[PDB]
Symmetry: C3
Subunit: 305 residues, 3 copies
């Protein structure tokens, strides 16, 4: 039961979740029931679970509670347009993974933490933050009245945990390049097969990347506005890097503000476009992300003068 | 028992409440006792009521807790200089209405909510936020140990509720233009009469507008500083409008920052000056607001170069 | 048990405490044990005490919780390099004083409070905020399970309170000029004597100044970044001054932003350099602060073009 405008435009890939946090949870529950079903989860146990997650997000310009819901909607959009491809376990499992994918994020990349010699970097040699994101998740599920998979069998429960584990880790962009490249080949040869679990995890992996980056697939005015939040995080990290006696890459250097239009251009070309390209090849219904992406690419070129 | 400088300068229309929240409540209690009386309200029940209201204001650049107290002081200033015109019910009733007049405000106008298709817009077809502001008020009064009108008769209680209702709704600027225009005529013909309840509500209505806008009646340095908070709210709304695929009016368009000195000029001419003009006509003691207002008008013209 | 990079670089004067609050407490406990000893304080009672102090710091751009820890580290650095000069009482006493030295600070100088006619200004005729900082301290100690000097004798306890009292008051910069000038003479004549308690308090006094200002002794990139937080506080105060119908000194005037490179130059020359100069004269191990200070002085001159 969502407002008419929302019920209608929530099915759109480029949908924005507005500036109404209090309404954010509701928007999520709605999507679970439309994609998975009403009796997938007990309402109260779910709502309790949601509030807890909202609470374990930090007020960081970009990787915050809004990012979490936004990413999830893209997944919902992907799920609804490929409705016959996945089980409920995967559906109910993937939506949850998206909301938790950046839990307890502080706004610093894995690079900085290793430089800073942070306790977590010692704890997780690779994919430091993402491993923490999943750690946070399990802690929340282990809370009383928080196990929404209570009704699941221990077999099913373990399965959905793996799904969520694999998914969350995939939000490490460093892992993306190897994943896309592999998928690019397998698609070409025809060896690519969704019934292969090893193959299947990789698609899911690429699906997660598409969502984590979906701000490039929004309309131009949203994409441009979201951009401010992201560099806010980058430049701040650059500052802390500088506090370590370390010259940061120009991307995190606030002195190089002008360069940003080209910095984005390069990123689209090298990362974003190849990503949604590959995805539409495998999942044609996901093209609107790609089209919207290129529309934004054209805008960036239009910025340079 | 307020500091000497405060006790002295609190009687000034252009008084500013400083940056000491913790001291804000105290400043309010003081005004209730000077305008209405000590035994108007039970201290503890009042303080409890105040903290609750402070809690239900949001950290929004302008329409926040500070706005609430500031608006109330102007009313106090109006009440003290027209001391023989109103009953205690109206006095105690109007001060309370001013503090609650923007309860749970989020920083977006009624226009945006209707565009966004917000639940409240469906709930309140007209004067969406203001109806909510009064709804919030009643909820707080209905809290235990929060009914400061407990000592009032059910007749008096209902009366003061109407006063507060009517008052709060009047803070809708859309309603102002019709109200001023009517008052402008009645004053001219002489038909205007304070003993007429229909007439009486309209004055109260115009009094509320004067307070909600009183930042134009502060000294120039305060008026200029307060201005930043307001456009912060506007431009943000423009951003969200843009997120709806809707080109917002230049006032909410942050791209048109330069234009602001003229934007303010137009507003003074068309809205602010006619407002305090009419008010002084009816209530001559309220002229300092008008004088201070024009002093700020002269400053805006002085800005354009 | 701190990360390797931290264990190593925490002994450096120009050490920065990073952007990990959750890790800030730990960094403090570590320093107490390295400077004073493990059985100086009961762990739990200490941790309880720390969290309470963190809670009574305000989110003010500069004089906040980070400032508190940063100042304390400098003291630790001073203590560790002059290990044979002080008793444990003084050590355990001074580290604590540094963390509490700006408790409940709101970001306004004593000048503004007197102008504003604030309740505290009436309460404390001189060194208004600093007297409050110590008042806050005592209140926290008087909390249950918060008396970390519980194990101390009432004689020792009173002694450490005086130490803390004297120390905190010394963070009033107005008092500094008279203190340095006296120390400058006594050092010259040879009359300066650490066994003299009157003399001894003055050194401690100058040590506190060195720490409160230690942002000038950090590396250039940190010093420059910290600078933003400080003027944020100044300009805001200027704004409130203007709200009092009072033209503030150019330092708190945000209109005079350009002037800042020279404003800092003057400060170094007149205040910072003479301070660390005198300190190294008395305590040669504290020279790195001075060297780092001048390195930053050279940078400011390099700014002017
Ligand atoms: C973990 C990893 O590999 N990362 C690299 C890419 C980066 C990134 N993520 C984005 C997510 C959403 C939308 C845009 C994103 N853009 C990213 O980096 C591109 C934007 N960039 C640059 C590059 C060079 C620049 C030089 C000067 C000024 C700005 C620059 N911006 C690169 C995130 C970290
Ligand atoms: C609800 C309603 O009718 N509103 C119209 C007036 C508006 C408003 N409120 C003020 C309250 C206190 C002080 C000043 C206020 N100014 C307001 O709007 C005026 C300021 N404005 C403009 C107008 C056009 C502009 C064009 C370009 C750049 C800035 C502009 N500012 C109009 C509030 C919403
Ligand atoms: C209490 C007292 O005596 N104060 C004077 C010095 C001031 C101060 N504290 C600092 C602490 C750490 C680092 C730098 C600090 N700088 C301070 O003031 C200097 C910086 N200044 C100026 C002076 C004049 C200016 C004129 C135009 C623009 C900027 C200016 N900045 C002076 C603090 C208040
Ligand atoms: Zn992430
Ligand atoms: Zn993410
Ligand atoms: Zn309002
Ligand atoms: Zn208002
Ligand atoms: Zn201080
Ligand atoms: Zn300080």
């Amino acid at each position: 039961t969502l407002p008419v405008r929302l019920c209608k435009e929530i099915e759109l890939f480029h949908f924005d979740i507005g500036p109404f946090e209090n309404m954010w949870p509701g928007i999520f529950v709605y999507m679970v029931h439309r994609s998975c079903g009403t009796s997938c989860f007990e309402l109260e146990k779910l709502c309790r679970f949601i509030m807890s997650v909202k609470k374990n997000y930090r007020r960081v310009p970009y990787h915050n509670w809004k990012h979490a819901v936004t990413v999830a909607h893209c997944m919902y959009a992907i799920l609804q347009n490929n409705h016959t491809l996945f089980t409920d376990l995967e559906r109910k499992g993937l939506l949850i993974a998206c909301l938790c994918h950046d839990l307890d994020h502080r706004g610093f990349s894995n690079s900085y933490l290793q430089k800073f010699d942070h306790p977590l970097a010692a704890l997780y040699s690779t994919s430091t933050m993402e491993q923490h994101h999943f750690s946070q998740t399990v802690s929340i599920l282990q809370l009383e009245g928080h196990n929404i998979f209570s009704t699941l069998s221990s077999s099913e429960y373990e399965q959905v945990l793996e799904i969520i584990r694999k998914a969350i880790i995939a939000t490490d962009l460093a892992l993306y390049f190897g994943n896309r490249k592999q998928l690019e080949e397998m698609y070409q040869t025809g060896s690519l097969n969704l019934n292969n679990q090893s193959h299947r995890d990789r698609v899911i992996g690429l699906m997660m990347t598409a969502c984590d980056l979906c701000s490039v697939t929004k309309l131009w005015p949203v994409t441009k506005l979201t951009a401010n939040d992201i560099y806010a995080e980058f430049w701040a990290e650059g500052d802390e890097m500088k506090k370590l006696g370390i010259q940061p890459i120009p991307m995190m250097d606030r002195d190089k503000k002008d360069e940003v239009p080209q910095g984005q251009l390069g990123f689209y070309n090298a990362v974003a476009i190849p990503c949604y390209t590959t995805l539409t090849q495998i999942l044609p219904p996901t093209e609107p992300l790609l089209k919207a992406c290129r529309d934004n690419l054209s805008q960036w070129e239009k910025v340079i003068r």
